[PDB]
Write a protein that binds this ligand. Sequence first.
Ligand code: ATP
Lengths: 78, 83
Amino acid sequence: DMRNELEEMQRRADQLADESLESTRRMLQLVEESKDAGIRTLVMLDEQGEQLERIEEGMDQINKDMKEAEKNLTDLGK
Amino acid sequence: QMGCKHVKGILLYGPPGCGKTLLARQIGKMLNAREPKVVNGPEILNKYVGESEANIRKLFADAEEEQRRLGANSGLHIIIFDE
Ligand SMILES: Nc1ncnc2c1ncn2[C@@H]1O[C@H](COP(=O)(O)OP(=O)(O)OP(=O)(O)O)[C@@H](O)[C@H]1O
């Protein structure tokens, strides 16, 4: 009558982490810095676009003025 | 008014082949109630510590909930233990 039976106990392997808290924090800090740099680039790019738009009008005005002056001088000369 | 409680148990015994399971089945199908639970022999045992008692506890979980909710207007819950 040496017929034995058993029961079982369970253990849980550690969840997936303990490497997600050293590279993670550095990743977040770098992401924040990149976000700030992107915001600054946004602002600078908008300012540059405004300045180019401003330049356009003066360019067109000088072109028109020179063309009209040349035509007038030619007309009077002949 | 009589202030009495209801019976909650029946036992049938005798020699083989004399009609015990038939009577239980016909009783089960005679009552306008839920679908009776059936336990076929040692169907509850489990090898993990504390897992063969949760099986016992699980059979009364609907009766307890309905008793808590509806009080004295609840239906009837049948349970059958074979062997
Ligand atoms: N009183 C009875 N009237 C009609 N048929 C019966 C009766 N008793 C037994 N039988 C017949 O016997 C069959 C099997 O009997 P049953 O399974 O009810 O016996 P049992 O007492 O559960 O036996 P066991 O001891 O093996 O559990 C039923 O399906 C039925 O056909």
